[PDB]
Design an enzyme around this catalytic site. Structure first.
Site, PDB file in Angstrom:
ATOM      1  N   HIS B  17       0.876  -1.404  -0.108  1.00  0.00           N
ATOM      2  CA  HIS B  17      -0.677   0.608   0.126  1.00  0.00           C
ATOM      3  C   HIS B  17       0.728   1.331   0.030  1.00  0.00           C
ATOM      4  CE1 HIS B  17      -2.784  -2.840   2.347  1.00  0.00           C
ATOM      5  NE2 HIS B  17      -3.459  -2.215   1.083  1.00  0.00           N
ATOM      6  N   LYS B  41     -16.369  -7.032   6.639  1.00  0.00           N
ATOM      7  CA  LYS B  41     -14.699  -7.162   6.933  1.00  0.00           C
ATOM      8  C   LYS B  41     -14.851  -7.968   8.351  1.00  0.00           C
ATOM      9  CE  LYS B  41     -13.311  -5.854   1.829  1.00  0.00           C
ATOM     10  NZ  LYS B  41     -12.578  -4.583   0.982  1.00  0.00           N
ATOM     11  N   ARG B  90      -2.170  -6.404  -8.502  1.00  0.00           N
ATOM     12  CA  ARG B  90      -1.085  -7.216  -8.266  1.00  0.00           C
ATOM     13  C   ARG B  90      -1.513  -8.330  -9.171  1.00  0.00           C
ATOM     14  NH1 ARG B  90      -2.925  -7.330  -2.675  1.00  0.00           N
ATOM     15  NH2 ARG B  90      -3.884  -8.780  -3.009  1.00  0.00           N
ATOM     16  N   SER B 128      -3.097  -7.964   2.786  1.00  0.00           N
ATOM     17  CA  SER B 128      -3.273  -7.242   4.357  1.00  0.00           C
ATOM     18  C   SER B 128      -3.160  -8.692   4.650  1.00  0.00           C
ATOM     19  CB  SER B 128      -3.978  -6.711   4.675  1.00  0.00           C
ATOM     20  OG  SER B 128      -3.901  -5.101   4.533  1.00  0.00           O
TER      21      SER B 128
END
Ligand SMILES: Cc1cc(Nc2ccc(C)c(Cl)c2)[n+]2nc(Cc3ccccc3)[nH]c2n1
Ligand SMILES: Cc1cc(Nc2ccc(C)c(Cl)c2)[n+]2nc(Cc3ccccc3)[nH]c2n1
Ligand SMILES: Cc1cc(Nc2ccc(C)c(Cl)c2)[n+]2nc(Cc3ccccc3)[nH]c2n1
EC number: 2.7.7.3
Lengths: 158, 158, 160, 160, 158, 160
Positions: B17, B41, B90, B128
């Site tokens: 990030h 989440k 990514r 993460s």
């Protein structure tokens, strides 16, 4: 008479689902829009609500029959005398998991042929999950849902 | 003055990030690093903790402003006067879900242009979630996180 | 910041998908160079002179676009043009793996150049210049996908 | 409904994967046209006459299949044949992005034609005519992947 | 003596897993089939049950050792003296997440080489999740599981 | 077990990504054959003799590697070499679908040969020999991606 089943959680049914079922009715004599109870998915709408929403959203299509089910998908297709299983394909990520289900359904009912249809570009980037996420944040989702469904989603979240 | 928003859950913010936000500050006058509350989440860190961690992790970048939000992403971008929405890419699996969000954000705010940036090869295989999984198992994640974040993650898991 | 961006491609021919991307790029950067590769590597339908004139007419309404031909690597040209942003269009049908290779290679060749992926309208997300050319060559209607000047030039090229 | 479907391809040569797909198509539509592209674009191993005869012999047991050569765009041919269904085989190794481009382009060219993706048996999900040809050309055993008539014709073609 | 570890949740072990471990035993001297406790995945079978099921399902393979673990995967591989880490690859969606884990395992233990093997076409479209979903709906999954596992799954769901 | 593995490819030229993979393979198998395809199918930049000498010099430090040219199908060669392991490099940019086709076809041709996918360092995960050649041919710096002997031979080839 060719009978096709279009199964799914339809929590709630979107314009992308309406697009697929409409394409299916132009190809097959009778289409069963089959709503899976799906308790493991913890759906926002009850099965009874999802059936009612889809019946109203598809009332304009004469050869669609909306039915809820909690059975194994292949057994429900056999019991509905369906020989075609319709699924929409919007992207690659759908395609891989769709292949697993289709090969499993073929193992369980070899005469049930899986068919994939591609939605309009208009609905190629939406999903029930995405529409619910936007609506949970008070974002306008009128464009993506049938009128009756949009009202129900606003009411459910109110 | 061009204002870009880089939204995400940042639970916690990683070096991947930091890489993206640093690339964004080299391209745009002002970057808002926008941390979504994301209760669905079930984040490991509270929104207040995530904001504090990201503020310290980005303190060296003069044109970054860290802000938490619970609003619809598009409304928050409009309210921050942002016209660019930054997201990192990514891999292919990211790309498909990123396209849905970007087309939805475009429907909700057509003048907010989505931009995708690609992180360094160094951070192309981390997330993460992955860093938290390793840390839950006492694996060394110092390489992947800012110093303040690594300390906070060790402390949270202790 | 007074950013200079480069939007490279073969543009053989330039489509509505390319116009969509370059338009989005002009709304975010101060100057956009629409960079047309000399590329006789995979024998183009339109020559470089044709490709440049078509792209100029089709972007003439965009005040901060400059159409320029180039024959070097896209990074060598971006460097000489003092561009710090490289625009890449990302369609729903793009080869993402190729885009990853290209971006990491461009970053190695010119670290000061940042690759920026923009998304076209859903309308142009499922097309390519290759698909458009093959359809047109095989007597299919491609009017919807092209600027009017391009459609007129393509019909002229296919007639011979 | 008396549906007419089209199953287009180069069929160079027709494989067990193609037979699997066309068989599935005949179980769901009243008439299936197995449409063989004239396609000298990427110089085919078998000529069009060879490709048609092989596909006829290999599908002779299917009463509602008609094998027909065509040289136009697959949509222009589907229109002239009054087909409303376009069959596409989706293998585990298919280029899904290409299939998306193709289907959206076919829909633009002929909206009344619906693209239908069928899945072959797992047995044929990891092959392609290209792979089969390259293996056979390089002295590998491809007997398992082809109808017997095709295998005999392929051995004859490779012998010369 | 070359020692390979084949880690996973194995909830429950399927014929696809048996295929992979069998390929691994033909290539390496000793294979440790390592069952991760995985509490975050809320497994259907306890770790003790999963170990017992896999031991019986692999009893015919002389060079397989079944072991449960709750450690970081890389630490457990080091502690088992393994230098090869086996994972199956059935599809693209597997491949991307498999790459993240392999690059993370390489960071944590550079001498542990990740190896990917491809299962038989027969098991290329199945997963423990899919088999459990079918079985929850009373669908026949005898084809996809070792005999002892199929009995245990029927019993667990009864 | 005294395993013999084969690592086939065109190696046109051999890159640091290939050296990374073959090095990993030598740490897990007793003997690794780096198998160079004669492949004039897609006219290689370096001839087979050049490709073999470069790969030998670049792997000379690895005691259990043998560099060998081959002109048959990779399975026919693996069989004749008594190899039971087939090494494939899996980059983040690899065509996974192609690798699946190849592995299932190799398994059909030679069931006793197991395909083993190894992952290169993140450093080489976004390159290909094709990309490296195109960059070098178009005046881009590829020094970082190649062994020193290969870089010297590539500069010599591009100079003419
Ligand atoms: C880094 C790089 C690669 C490359 N071509 C290439 C080759 C192989 C692979 C596997 C990949 Cl990923 C890319 N080109 N082509 C150019 C010139 C150009 C610009 C715009 C359109 C066409 C040509 N510039 C450049 N720069
Ligand atoms: C719409 C369309 C495209 C097209 N070719 C094509 C070109 C480029 C792209 C990027 C894509 Cl996605 C497709 N062809 N080839 C045909 C004729 C044909 C039929 C069956 C097999 C071979 C040839 N018909 C048709 N129709
Ligand atoms: C099974 C098989 C296929 C094949 N080529 C091929 C063709 C088409 C497809 C669609 C696919 Cl997936 C592969 N080759 N090329 C060879 C020889 C060789 C070895 C190493 C590098 C280059 C050439 N050996 C082999 N074996």
């Amino acid at each position: 008479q060719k009978r096709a089943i279009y199964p799914g959680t339809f929590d709630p049914i979107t314009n992308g689902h309406i697009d697929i079922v409409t394409r299916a009715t132009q190809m097959f004599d009778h289409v069963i829009l089959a709503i899976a109870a799906s308790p493991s998915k913890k759906p926002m709408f009850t099965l009874e609500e999802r059936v009612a929403l889809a019946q109203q959203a598809t009332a304009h299509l004469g050869n669609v029959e909306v039915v809820g089910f909690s059975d194994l998908m292949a057994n429900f297709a056999r019991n509905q005398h369906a020989t075609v299983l319709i699924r929409g394909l919007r992207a690659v990520a759908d395609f891989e998991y769709e292949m697993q289900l289709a090969h499993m359904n073929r193992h369980l009912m070899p005469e049930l042929e899986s068919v994939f249809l591609m939605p309009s570009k208009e609905w190629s980037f939406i999903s029930s999950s995405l529409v619910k996420e936007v609506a949970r944040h008070q974002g306008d989702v009128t464009h993506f849902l049938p009128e009756n469904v949009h009202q129900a989603l606003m009411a459910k979240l109110a």
